Amino acid sequence: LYFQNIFEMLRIDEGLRLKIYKDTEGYYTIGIGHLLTKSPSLNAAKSELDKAIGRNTNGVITKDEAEKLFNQDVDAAVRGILRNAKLKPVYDSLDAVRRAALINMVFQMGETGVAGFTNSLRMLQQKRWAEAAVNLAKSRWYNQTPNRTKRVITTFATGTWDAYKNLRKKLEQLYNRYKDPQDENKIGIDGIQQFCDDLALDPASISVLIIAWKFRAATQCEFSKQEFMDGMTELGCDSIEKLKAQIPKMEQELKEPGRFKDFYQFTFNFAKNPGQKGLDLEMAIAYWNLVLNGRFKFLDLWNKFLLEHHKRSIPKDTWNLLLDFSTMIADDMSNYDEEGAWPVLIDDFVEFARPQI
Numbered sequence: 221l222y223f224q225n226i227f228e229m230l231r232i233d234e235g236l237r238l239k240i241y242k243d244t245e246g247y248y249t250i251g252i253g254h255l256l257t258k259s260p261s262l263n264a265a266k267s268e269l270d271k272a273i274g275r276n277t278n279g280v281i282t283k284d285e286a287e288k289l290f291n292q293d294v295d296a297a298v299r300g301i302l303r304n305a306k307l308k309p310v311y312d313s314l315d316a317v318r319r320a321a322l323i324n325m326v327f328q329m330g331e332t333g334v335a336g337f338t339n340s341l342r343m344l345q346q347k348r349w350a351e352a353a354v355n356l357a358k359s360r361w362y363n364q365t366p367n368r369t370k371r372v373i374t375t376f377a378t379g380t381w382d383a384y385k386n387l388r389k390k391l392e393q394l395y396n397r398y399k400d401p402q403d404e405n406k407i408g409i410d411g412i413q414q415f416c417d418d419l420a421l422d423p424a425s426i427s428v429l430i431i432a433w434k435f436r437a438a439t440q441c442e443f444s445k446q447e448f449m450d451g452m453t454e455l456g457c458d459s460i461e462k463l464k465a466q467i468p469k470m471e472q473e474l475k476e477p478g479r480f481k482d483f484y485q486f487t488f489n490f491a492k493n494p495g496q497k498g499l500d501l502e503m504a505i506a507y508w509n510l511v512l513n514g515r516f517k518f519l520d521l522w523n524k525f526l527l528e529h530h531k532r533s534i535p536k537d538t539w540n541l542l543l544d545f546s547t548m549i550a551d552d553m554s555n556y557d558e559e560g561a562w563p564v565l566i567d568d569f570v571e572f573a574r575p576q577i
């Protein structure tokens with residue numbers, strides 16, 4: 221197999237997941253789009269992953285394990301390309317760099333999706349790079365994934381890695397402005413503050429919490445190099461100005477309840493101290509004032525109730541259920557089912573709040 225840059229090309233274009241996840245079609249995936257099983261059983265998926273890696277992964281792998289799986293998928297894709305009468309001639313005629321761009325296309329839309337580009341594939345086989353580049357840019361493929369497609373088209377146009385190398389340069393230069401002088405592999409307190417100033421935002425603002433959600437950031441006041449790089453590439457941003465222009469779109473998303481729920485639940489995980497399962501009361505109230513502002517009539521009376529009668533950490537389930545509480549609760553609390561399944565804390569809040577109307 222050893223006799224046969226591509227891993228980094230697809231790490232950028234598709235993304236690398238180190239934890240077992242469900243893909244669009246609902247299948248159990250890991251690494252760079254590696255399918256584990258067609259089975260709806262996570263036990264089966266973990267069994268497949270464990271067998272393939274050779275350890276009890278519990279659904280979590282290293283980047284090197286993800287690479288082992290990725291090289292197997294490249295080999296399978298190449299074999300499939302070679303058994304395809306519409307793809308084999310083009311593939312055989314292409315240099316190593318342009319073959320990687322073709323394998324990239326197969327990874328995205330499959331063999332049938334790629335074979336549909338008959339005129340463009342012909343131009344590539346004929347080494348009419350300029351004509352192929354203009355023709356591939358007319359497709360829906362160019363509008364569905366503009367950033368990825370432009371990179372792939374550039375690879376076919378030049379036969380160089382310049383699209384990927386130049387994106388990494390621009391992001392590394394941008395990163396250097398924010399990295400911690402005491403720790404090059406992370407963005408510190410000062411760096412996060414600088415990042416927020418460049419965006420003309422306060423670090424305690426909702427816009428910055430929305431950005432953290434979009435970057436899938438782990439914890440408040442922490443920002444790793446990997447979070448910065450992966451976040452900027454996935455969002456299709458190579459500058460602060462480009463990130464700034466994405467903010468209205470992120471805002472509109474939150475008008476849809478499913479997205480808002482995902483953001484609201486993410487806030488708890490982001491806000492809490494690593495190593496702690498719960499969220500300290502003072503911090504829970506400060507984040508509730510940000511995310512439930514204009515969504516919960518009883519927000520202040522709730523904060524007052526907790527500061528005076530709870531005075532302890534907020535568990536994740538209670539945090540999640542407060543959103544459902546705020547949505548259904550009548551202004552007079554008459555529809556509250558006290559004989560229901562709400563946390564004891566919410567039952568106690570209703571009991572405390574009801575005499576005060």
Ligand SMILES: *C[C@H](CCN1CCOCC1)C(=O)NC[C@@H](NC(=O)[C@H](Cc1nc2ccc(C(C)C)cc2s1)NC(=O)CC)C1CCCCC1
Pocket residue numbers: 412415423424425426428429431432433435437439440441442443503506507510
């Ligand atoms: C970490 C900081 C230390 C404690 N400080 C208070 C007194 O003791 C010493 C100093 C802290 O907990 N501050 C609370 C504050 N949080 C924030 O301002 C955060 C800061 C950010 N963290 C990140 C991480 C990553 C990113 C990237 C995705 C760009 C950005 C930011 S900003 N902001 C937020 O969490 C956004 C709302 C309070 C803010 C208001 C809500 C309560 C906590």
